[PDB]
Design an enzyme around this catalytic site. Structure first.
Site, PDB file in Angstrom:
ATOM      1  N   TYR A 197       0.795  -1.245   0.000  1.00 31.01           N
ATOM      2  CA  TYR A 197       0.000   0.000   0.000  1.00 31.01           C
ATOM      3  C   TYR A 197       0.816   1.278   0.000  1.00 31.01           C
ATOM      4  O   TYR A 197       0.302   2.417   0.018  1.00 31.01           O
ATOM      5  CB  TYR A 197      -0.920   0.086   1.207  1.00 31.01           C
ATOM      6  CG  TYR A 197      -2.041  -0.896   1.171  1.00 31.01           C
ATOM      7  CD1 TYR A 197      -2.985  -0.810   0.167  1.00 31.01           C
ATOM      8  CD2 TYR A 197      -2.126  -1.943   2.087  1.00 31.01           C
ATOM      9  CE1 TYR A 197      -4.015  -1.708   0.092  1.00 31.01           C
ATOM     10  CE2 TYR A 197      -3.179  -2.847   2.037  1.00 31.01           C
ATOM     11  CZ  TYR A 197      -4.108  -2.717   1.031  1.00 31.01           C
ATOM     12  OH  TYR A 197      -5.156  -3.587   0.932  1.00 31.01           O
TER      13      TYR A 197
ATOM     14  N   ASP B  13      -1.983 -11.895   8.410  1.00 31.37           N
ATOM     15  CA  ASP B  13      -1.046 -12.907   7.895  1.00 31.37           C
ATOM     16  C   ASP B  13       0.434 -12.834   8.369  1.00 31.37           C
ATOM     17  O   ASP B  13       1.120 -13.859   8.511  1.00 31.37           O
ATOM     18  CB  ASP B  13      -1.025 -12.888   6.356  1.00 31.37           C
ATOM     19  CG  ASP B  13      -2.355 -13.217   5.709  1.00 31.37           C
ATOM     20  OD1 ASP B  13      -3.249 -13.840   6.318  1.00 31.37           O
ATOM     21  OD2 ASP B  13      -2.466 -12.835   4.533  1.00 31.37           O
TER      22      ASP B  13
ATOM     23  N   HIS C 184       4.787  -6.611  -3.912  1.00 32.18           N
ATOM     24  CA  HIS C 184       3.361  -6.818  -3.955  1.00 32.18           C
ATOM     25  C   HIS C 184       2.617  -5.512  -4.017  1.00 32.18           C
ATOM     26  O   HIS C 184       3.107  -4.493  -3.522  1.00 32.18           O
ATOM     27  CB  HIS C 184       2.880  -7.832  -2.898  1.00 32.18           C
ATOM     28  CG  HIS C 184       2.960  -7.391  -1.466  1.00 32.18           C
ATOM     29  ND1 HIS C 184       3.933  -6.554  -0.967  1.00 32.18           N
ATOM     30  CD2 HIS C 184       2.241  -7.799  -0.392  1.00 32.18           C
ATOM     31  CE1 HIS C 184       3.767  -6.414   0.339  1.00 32.18           C
ATOM     32  NE2 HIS C 184       2.748  -7.165   0.714  1.00 32.18           N
TER      33      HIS C 184
ATOM     34  N   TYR D  85     -11.728  -1.390  -0.422  1.00 36.23           N
ATOM     35  CA  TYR D  85     -11.788  -1.082   1.019  1.00 36.23           C
ATOM     36  C   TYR D  85     -10.525  -0.355   1.535  1.00 36.23           C
ATOM     37  O   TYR D  85     -10.607   0.349   2.524  1.00 36.23           O
ATOM     38  CB  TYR D  85     -12.077  -2.330   1.945  1.00 36.23           C
ATOM     39  CG  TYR D  85     -10.856  -2.976   2.667  1.00 36.23           C
ATOM     40  CD1 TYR D  85      -9.872  -3.679   1.940  1.00 36.23           C
ATOM     41  CD2 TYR D  85     -10.648  -2.815   4.064  1.00 36.23           C
ATOM     42  CE1 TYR D  85      -8.738  -4.223   2.545  1.00 36.23           C
ATOM     43  CE2 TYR D  85      -9.516  -3.377   4.681  1.00 36.23           C
ATOM     44  CZ  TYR D  85      -8.562  -4.084   3.912  1.00 36.23           C
ATOM     45  OH  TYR D  85      -7.430  -4.663   4.431  1.00 36.23           O
ATOM     46  N   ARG D  86      -9.370  -0.524   0.905  1.00 38.12           N
ATOM     47  CA  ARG D  86      -8.131   0.111   1.353  1.00 38.12           C
ATOM     48  C   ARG D  86      -7.231   0.200   0.122  1.00 38.12           C
ATOM     49  O   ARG D  86      -7.489  -0.572  -0.777  1.00 38.12           O
ATOM     50  CB  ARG D  86      -7.505  -0.735   2.480  1.00 38.12           C
ATOM     51  CG  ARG D  86      -6.048  -0.452   2.612  1.00 38.12           C
ATOM     52  CD  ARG D  86      -5.290  -0.666   3.942  1.00 38.12           C
ATOM     53  NE  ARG D  86      -5.395  -1.933   4.636  1.00 38.12           N
ATOM     54  CZ  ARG D  86      -4.525  -2.389   5.542  1.00 38.12           C
ATOM     55  NH1 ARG D  86      -3.415  -1.727   5.871  1.00 38.12           N
ATOM     56  NH2 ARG D  86      -4.754  -3.574   6.107  1.00 38.12           N
TER      57      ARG D  86
HETATM   58  C1  LIG Z   1       3.012  -7.860   1.962  1.00 36.96           C
HETATM   59  C2  LIG Z   1       1.808  -8.304   2.762  1.00 36.96           C
HETATM   60  C3  LIG Z   1       0.994  -7.355   3.396  1.00 36.96           C
HETATM   61  C4  LIG Z   1      -0.109  -7.745   4.168  1.00 36.96           C
HETATM   62  C5  LIG Z   1      -0.424  -9.131   4.266  1.00 36.96           C
HETATM   63  C6  LIG Z   1       0.387 -10.087   3.644  1.00 36.96           C
HETATM   64  C7  LIG Z   1       1.504  -9.691   2.896  1.00 36.96           C
HETATM   65  C8  LIG Z   1       2.378 -10.720   2.225  1.00 36.96           C
HETATM   66  N1  LIG Z   1      -1.527  -9.570   4.908  1.00 36.96           N
HETATM   67  C9  LIG Z   1      -2.334  -8.653   5.484  1.00 36.96           C
HETATM   68  C10 LIG Z   1      -3.441  -9.110   6.282  1.00 36.96           C
HETATM   69  O1  LIG Z   1      -3.732 -10.297   6.417  1.00 36.96           O
HETATM   70  N2  LIG Z   1      -4.195  -8.128   6.913  1.00 36.96           N
HETATM   71  C11 LIG Z   1      -3.875  -6.780   6.797  1.00 36.96           C
HETATM   72  O2  LIG Z   1      -4.576  -5.957   7.385  1.00 36.96           O
HETATM   73  N3  LIG Z   1      -2.841  -6.370   6.078  1.00 36.96           N
HETATM   74  C12 LIG Z   1      -2.065  -7.254   5.416  1.00 36.96           C
HETATM   75  N4  LIG Z   1      -0.930  -6.826   4.775  1.00 36.96           N
HETATM   76  C13 LIG Z   1      -0.645  -5.376   4.655  1.00 36.96           C
HETATM   77  C14 LIG Z   1       0.202  -4.811   5.795  1.00 36.96           C
HETATM   78  O3  LIG Z   1       1.355  -5.616   6.015  1.00 36.96           O
HETATM   79  C15 LIG Z   1      -0.560  -4.682   7.110  1.00 36.96           C
HETATM   80  O4  LIG Z   1      -1.779  -3.955   6.933  1.00 36.96           O
HETATM   81  C16 LIG Z   1       0.324  -3.992   8.146  1.00 36.96           C
HETATM   82  O5  LIG Z   1      -0.164  -4.287   9.450  1.00 36.96           O
HETATM   83  C17 LIG Z   1       0.364  -2.483   7.936  1.00 36.96           C
HETATM   84  O6  LIG Z   1       1.683  -1.975   8.084  1.00 36.96           O
HETATM   85  P1  LIG Z   1       1.950  -1.355   9.550  1.00 36.96           P
HETATM   86  O7  LIG Z   1       1.084  -2.063  10.530  1.00 36.96           O
HETATM   87  O8  LIG Z   1       3.425  -1.284   9.778  1.00 36.96           O
HETATM   88  O9  LIG Z   1       1.368   0.151   9.378  1.00 36.96           O
HETATM   89  P2  LIG Z   1       2.134   1.536   9.031  1.00 36.96           P
HETATM   90  O10 LIG Z   1       3.085   1.295   7.912  1.00 36.96           O
HETATM   91  O11 LIG Z   1       2.615   2.169  10.291  1.00 36.96           O
HETATM   92  O12 LIG Z   1       0.895   2.349   8.434  1.00 36.96           O
HETATM   93  C18 LIG Z   1      -0.288   2.583   8.935  1.00 36.96           C
HETATM   94  C19 LIG Z   1      -0.952   3.572   8.012  1.00 36.96           C
HETATM   95  O13 LIG Z   1      -2.091   4.008   8.802  1.00 36.96           O
HETATM   96  C20 LIG Z   1      -1.882   5.331   9.237  1.00 36.96           C
HETATM   97  N5  LIG Z   1      -1.205   5.411  10.536  1.00 36.96           N
HETATM   98  C21 LIG Z   1      -0.217   4.612  11.043  1.00 36.96           C
HETATM   99  N6  LIG Z   1       0.183   4.972  12.239  1.00 36.96           N
HETATM  100  C22 LIG Z   1      -0.586   6.088  12.528  1.00 36.96           C
HETATM  101  C23 LIG Z   1      -0.649   6.947  13.645  1.00 36.96           C
HETATM  102  N7  LIG Z   1       0.116   6.803  14.732  1.00 36.96           N
HETATM  103  N8  LIG Z   1      -1.532   7.967  13.606  1.00 36.96           N
HETATM  104  C24 LIG Z   1      -2.301   8.115  12.521  1.00 36.96           C
HETATM  105  N9  LIG Z   1      -2.329   7.374  11.414  1.00 36.96           N
HETATM  106  C25 LIG Z   1      -1.441   6.371  11.486  1.00 36.96           C
HETATM  107  C26 LIG Z   1      -1.080   5.962   8.118  1.00 36.96           C
HETATM  108  O14 LIG Z   1      -1.968   6.271   7.062  1.00 36.96           O
HETATM  109  C27 LIG Z   1      -0.116   4.830   7.752  1.00 36.96           C
HETATM  110  O15 LIG Z   1       0.167   4.967   6.352  1.00 36.96           O
HETATM  111 CL   LIG Z   2       0.409  -8.923   7.499  1.00 37.38          CL
END
Ligand SMILES: *Cc1cc2c(cc1C)nc1c(=O)[nH]c(=O)nc-1n2C[C@H](O)[C@H](O)[C@H](O)COP(=O)(O)OP(=O)(O)OC[C@H]1O[C@@H](n2cnc3c(N)ncnc32)[C@H](O)[C@@H]1O
Ligand SMILES: [Cl-]
Ligand SMILES: *Cc1cc2c(cc1C)nc1c(=O)[nH]c(=O)nc-1n2C[C@H](O)[C@H](O)[C@H](O)COP(=O)(O)OP(=O)(O)OC[C@H]1O[C@@H](n2cnc3c(N)ncnc32)[C@H](O)[C@@H]1O
Ligand SMILES: *Cc1cc2c(cc1C)nc1c(=O)[nH]c(=O)nc-1n2C[C@H](O)[C@H](O)[C@H](O)COP(=O)(O)OP(=O)(O)OC[C@H]1O[C@@H](n2cnc3c(N)ncnc32)[C@H](O)[C@@H]1O
Ligand SMILES: [Cl-]
Ligand SMILES: [Cl-]
Lengths: 550, 550, 550
Positions: free
Chosen positions: C98, C160, C412, C493-494
């Site tokens: 994403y 996952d 991906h 959805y996302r």
């Molecule tokens: C490559 C992949 C990804 C994946 C997955 C399987 C694979 C092989 N399976 C998933 C699954 O089963 N379910 C799911 O929800 N996601 C799945 N993914 C995608 C991804 O790995 C996950 O969603 C992952 O948990 C998200 O990355 P992370 O948890 O590290 O989040 P982040 O990079 O920090 O980003 C969050 C986004 O939301 C907003 N955000 C984040 N932190 C804040 C705070 N503190 N305040 C406000 N907004 C926040 C931002 O928009 C950020 O971009």
């Molecule tokens: Cl994940």
């Protein structure tokens, strides 16, 4: 007058009535009709769309008002800015196929400029031009030339019908068939009432005629124009005249439109293309002859149903609710002595030159099998070449209206995409459109008008204005055609009240840079949004996209 | 760079230096030159007017900046809006006779778009068009066609000289000699950087090309255009393209300009008019043949001094500070085998048709005594018909420059009124102007270019840029000519940096309705006044008429 | 630090440097890295998208900044509002698929909240909840429970992979596989730093904990929460917590996420669906059992390539650049002992009840031929059921990453439409998508996650981040899929940084009423546009749609 069926946005009834009264005082009771059915191409309606696709009173005026002269227009505009009443200016109102006299915003005041503002202001022979007011229709211009014996020196340029306004058509960037067909490109120096109520004259129209006794003290509306007003559109500085075509930028009070001197010779003709698939080679044929000038005016390639239609109702060809099959067309085509696709053109000038042009044209089209050439003479009394004959020489008619008659309460609606002058592209477009007309259960009927390096594909949607199911298929067809063509890299040149937003949304390169630039210019000059809000999808900021678009 | 000779309005030195640094970081040290003499038509100056009427550094840049691509332009504009630094966009800067590369407002940054933004973006044969960047000069376009062997399919349309920008000329509404002479009317779909920094594409340029892998992810500047972009200028809605000609409305990044297919035949010629007074009948002669098309391209009627001048310096005709008398002209005219007034034209197409056109032309001009026809062949190696021969077929030259050479440090300044195509009107105008050139002690030198229902009278003021007394007579001549012609109902079509205000003040019908409408539109789109303030006399509100006009 | 590769909008270099210095003073040199390559799921990059579709530095940070605690965040925000510097808050940055850690707007400061703000704030057993900071990843939460022996009382709910942030996932409205899969719906009382810098706690989080010595004088960030904070999300009045999911409304400092008590029994399983066409009946099968609860957690229906892929690179199945044919899939499917479509689920609670649930499930799926049931035991050591086994019980893994490995430099990108729980609708969607993956030359790979009355169709686009041609086909695929599904009544959805605008434009019922309402709310709370402009396509007014969208 007392209580309309529909009031413009945010206006109270008392306000309607106050404004309304001030106005009777300005223009006369006779110049106004408040609205507390459709009519005729012959006696057109000012209140709404007669050829209505949506519901009849869907787009509707609160009152009709006829300015007796430019001052009134300045007066109505002042009052409209007082109350925030929107204006919907029309010259003649024959924009049927696009909405007619109807306003984008219901409850608006319809201004028929054309009733009292009918004058031929000038027909200049040396300069080869005329100057006109909105009420000046094409027939009228013709009759003006006849009765002043000007026929032998100068020729008019007409669209398919005789009742349109020379002025209004030009603003719409309308089209006709002589070598002077690009109407808009033929104008020079025009006058408009701005939204603020102030008068403006474009180009060399800004260079004031020099002073003299005879002209002293006349109202500006009433002043003659400088010598170059009507001979060089540019004037000096930013060339702003176009903000006046298909826009909500102002009220056009007058305009100079260039006239073609009698050419010293004229020959019109027809070339029948036997097969549906012939559109392809014919277009590749028309291409270099157009860029090169063997082809002079704007020639047109018509589909058989159009001629079949000027000839007779669907009912007198077949009792079938369904669309006629590709075999029934070939039959009609034969009965009429026409082709699948029919080409009309005309020759201009010395026989010696026509002679050479015709030999070239006749020779190119010959690579097409079953091809056949005719001159009006060579065809029947009720023929279309016979009518278009007058048409290609500036002479006005109305025979073409019968085509609107294909269906019981036929009404036309125009899909007007543009295509390259390529057999390939034209074939592609015809396909996309034809298919959809089919899914909607409608006969595809149309014609491509030949521009010099582009073509106007006028798809003629005819339908029964009294059939809800159908009327609905029509709105589905339209919006669909609109999306399909854009998907193919093609957009429409002009459209109906109901598809303006949709079509403008099409013109979106770089995040809608175009509508946005447009919006910025309109608010500047029309801070109160009083002049035609929504036209071409351009909305004053006072108008909510959420509440307004379609 | 450190400390200019002149700073734009209200900018501190540190601010100049900050802005300046941000920019080196954007475009490269190489793309910028801060200014802490005139040059060549061949190696034109970007800092000021080389043919300067006022003082040399009168109109002068603070720094010169060369954008490497459209993004830079978007970047410079963002920075210019930050600091309120005005921009003066030029394509090539050869607008000598009108100011050259010089900015109306001194201390402005001169943007030479043409250095890095030189590309022929496309030459479309079926569509018969080309798409271009500012750095694309005419010679360059020619060489582009030659080396891609396109010469046989399509012809260019050039003004008198080869070094101008196809683009810049068009914006100025420049002119050339083939049937495609109205440059501006030949354009379709252009791209501009607005004052806000946003990109816009006009007409069908707004209808986005459909999506595809190959094109994914390219910057908008970099996206191809839809199929109709360059074939139908109108697009849909308000036709706003003209706010881009002779205006301060935006920075033009690219433009489509239509090309004439090789016509299949070409014949150029000269007709010498013996008497000074012959201008009269010749014009009445040219009149109906132009409206009728025996006359094709834009033919030109030249005054003897112009050819005398391409031929040799005043000094090699007579050592006389004074203007040469009417008898000395008749002498020069004879030595050269030319007339008092000289007419050049060209024929296009099949010999069979040229044949008939020429018989008609040759016959009309015969009512003029002492008339004589020639073909390039029929004349000397150094002849002007010989040069214009290439000229009327789209082939670029520079021989005409020698005319600038009449005086020791000759510099040209153009008075460019417009006159009707009437012997009477043209005679009247020539009079008024001739007389004044006399009181100023100058040889009158000029040519009328034949429009279809108007004529461009280009009066060529040549003077010694190194003579204060003279330079002063020139400013007196100009402003005077300007008032006299307007008094006669005629106004100029294009002008120099120094007479813009004056000329715009001329276009005053109805209390200056025109400049006012214009002002309203510019402030809307250029709220910070950063793009070319003062151009065509149009001032941002941040600019005081009291402080700014002349 | 000195000079970034990219600066946020309108910020001068000195301004970058001033802001930058103030900040080193706030957080420590150690908490900041100015940027003057991609990395690992294991050691994720904060500067940009590692799985980049566009150009690598297309979306890129100007500097990376690590707040040591909530105060810093309040401080950075104050400074960001001073300079108008935009913030891009991330918890862990594993949003690969994403965009990863990358900011919609390049030059923004990336805030990694997770580095210093890593704490498990509370694990409440009676209340069955935990309270967390962004740096708290899933593994970490697990290890926290293990080492505090909480494993036997409460279970986690994982997506996952193991490295995501419990918090960030929840905000994104992420998903996992136990009966507590709807992550977002599991939260209660969260804390956010508003754009103004002020702290807010939602729901019962607003009802302040009563006063006491022990708690006196602690900073608000530091105050304990009232008793109901984490047990009833609603609190009193407008329930505003959602403006915090997939929005630019604030910075989330902490959140309460509900925990599932050990269920007293668990059984995971697999049911292989032999034919590609079986997706149809299986879905109609899954339907009533889901609404009824025989189906507990969020079960998933996987496509063979996904398991094939966790198993091995495309290269070890076939050396074919092309996509594998429908026959090669059936082969792989057989080699693996799997189906065409594979269904994983899990049972929870007393054996007596699991017993009955399983008899019902096993019986319904039997109408499918060649159907086969397995338990982890019944399958190989490297099996996916074996991995998902831990997964469906809240135990974290990383084996699933190997699927990203299908291609040489696999990356991906997720297309994430939603479909009804209808065999028919699901079949339709799979079709539309499958076809397009084909035209792009890509293997279609995906899984539908079973919601209770909806399904999340996760199409897994894998590609070589090092192949321009391909990367381009990917952008074409995406935007196309996006339009096709919407045309079919389905929306995502996302999504990724690059398709947000596009996707939001999809959600246009009634002239975009939704984006507009959204815009109005964001400007109110983020008058200076400092927090994540462009996220979900929501733009501060300071951000031009023309300059910003894609
Ligand atoms: C490559 C992949 C990804 C994946 C997955 C399987 C694979 C092989 N399976 C998933 C699954 O089963 N379910 C799911 O929800 N996601 C799945 N993914 C995608 C991804 O790995 C996950 O969603 C992952 O948990 C998200 O990355 P992370 O948890 O590290 O989040 P982040 O990079 O920090 O980003 C969050 C986004 O939301 C907003 N955000 C984040 N932190 C804040 C705070 N503190 N305040 C406000 N907004 C926040 C931002 O928009 C950020 O971009
Ligand atoms: Cl994940
Ligand atoms: C039914 C039909 C229509 C038709 C046609 C054949 C048939 C069977 N063939 C056409 C053709 O060959 N060429 C062409 O341009 N149009 C053709 N049409 C359509 C239509 O009949 C004509 O375009 C007709 O000339 C237009 O109607 P009219 O001329 O009466 O114009 P109007 O109703 O007054 O509307 C003009 C519109 O432009 C703006 N407008 C009009 N007047 C003003 C003023 N004074 N100031 C500012 N704007 C003005 C308005 O937007 C108005 O809606
Ligand atoms: C000395 C002379 C000049 C001349 C001529 C014969 C002689 C001996 N014959 C001409 C002719 O037959 N036709 C004609 O149009 N001009 C003739 N000239 C004058 C001049 O040489 C030409 O007009 C020449 O083509 C113009 O110079 P150039 O083409 O180099 O244009 P420029 O210096 O860049 O200026 C263009 C002006 O227009 C605006 N402009 C230019 N570029 C842009 C961009 N990118 N965006 C927006 N506006 C732009 C500016 O106002 C600039 O001042
Ligand atoms: Cl008509
Ligand atoms: Cl030139």
């Amino acid at each position: 007058e007392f209580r309309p069926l529909t009031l413009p946005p945010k206006l109270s009834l008392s306000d309607f009535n106050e404004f309304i009264q001030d106005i009777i005082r300005i223009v006369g009771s006779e110049n106004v009709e408040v609205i507390s059915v459709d009519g005729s191409y012959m006696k057109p309606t000012h209140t709404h769309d007669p050829h209505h696709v949506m519901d009849q009173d869907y787009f509707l005026a609160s009152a009709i008002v006829a300015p007796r002269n430019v001052a009134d227009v300045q007066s109505i505009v002042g009052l409209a800015n007082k109350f925030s009443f929107p204006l919907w200016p029309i010259s003649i109102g024959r924009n049927s196929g696009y909405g007619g006299a109807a306003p984008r915003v219901s409850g608006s005041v319809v201004l028929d400029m054309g009733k009292n503002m009918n004058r031929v202001l000038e027909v200049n022979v040396e300069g080869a031009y005329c100057v006109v007011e909105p009420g000046v229709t094409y027939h009228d211009l013709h009759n003006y030339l006849e009765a002043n014996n000007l026929r032998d020196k100068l020729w008019l340029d007409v669209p398919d019908l005789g009742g349109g306004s020379v002025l209004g058509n030009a603003v719409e960037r309308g089209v006709g068939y002589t070598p002077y067909g690009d109407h808009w490109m033929m104008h020079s120096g025009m006058e408009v009432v701005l939204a603020n109520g102030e008068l403006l004259r474009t180009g060399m129209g800004a260079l004031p005629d020099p002073k003299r006794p005879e002209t002293m003290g006349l109202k500006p509306e009433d002043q003659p124009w400088s010598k170059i007003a009507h001979l060089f559109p540019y004037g000096f500085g930013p060339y702003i005249d176009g903000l006046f075509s298909q826009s909500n930028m102002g009220i056009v009070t007058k305009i100079g439109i260039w006239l073609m001197p009698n050419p010293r010779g004229y020959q019109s003709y027809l070339i029948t293309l036997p097969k549906d698939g012939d559109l392809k080679q014919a277009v590749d044929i028309i291409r270099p002859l157009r860029l090169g000038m063997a082809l002079q005016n704007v020639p047109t390639i018509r589909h058989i149903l159009l001629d079949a239609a000027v000839l007779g109702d669907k009912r007198s060809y077949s009792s079938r609710t369904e669309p006629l099959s590709d075999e029934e067309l070939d039959k009609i085509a034969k009965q009429l002595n026409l082709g699948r696709w029919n080409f009309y053109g005309a020759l201009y000038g010395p026989e010696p030159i026509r002679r050479v042009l015709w030999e070239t044209i006749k020779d190119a089209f010959s690579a097409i099998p079953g091809v056949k050439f005719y001159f009006p003479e060579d065809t029947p009394e009720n023929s279309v070449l016979r009518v278009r004959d007058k048409t290609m020489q500036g002479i006005p008619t109305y025979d073409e209206l019968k085509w609107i008659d294909w269906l019981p309460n036929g009404a036309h609606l125009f899909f007007s995409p543009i295509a390259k002058v390529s057999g390939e592209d034209a074939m592609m477009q015809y396909a996309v459109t034809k298919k959809r007309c089919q899914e909607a259960g409608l006969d595809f009927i149309g014609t491509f008008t030949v521009g010099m390096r582009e073509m106007h594909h006028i798809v003629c949607i005819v339908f029964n204005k009294k059939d809800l199911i159908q009327k609905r298929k029509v709105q589905w067809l339209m919006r669909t055609l609109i999306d399909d063509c854009a998907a193919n890299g093609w957009g429409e040149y002009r459209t109906h009240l109901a598809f303006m937003d949709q079509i403008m949304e099409t013109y979106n390169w770089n995040n809608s840079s175009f509508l946005r630039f447009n919006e910025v210019l309109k608010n500047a000059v029309d801070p109160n949004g009083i002049i035609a809000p929504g036209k071409s999808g351009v909305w004053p900021s006072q108008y909510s996209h959420v509440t307004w678009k379609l």
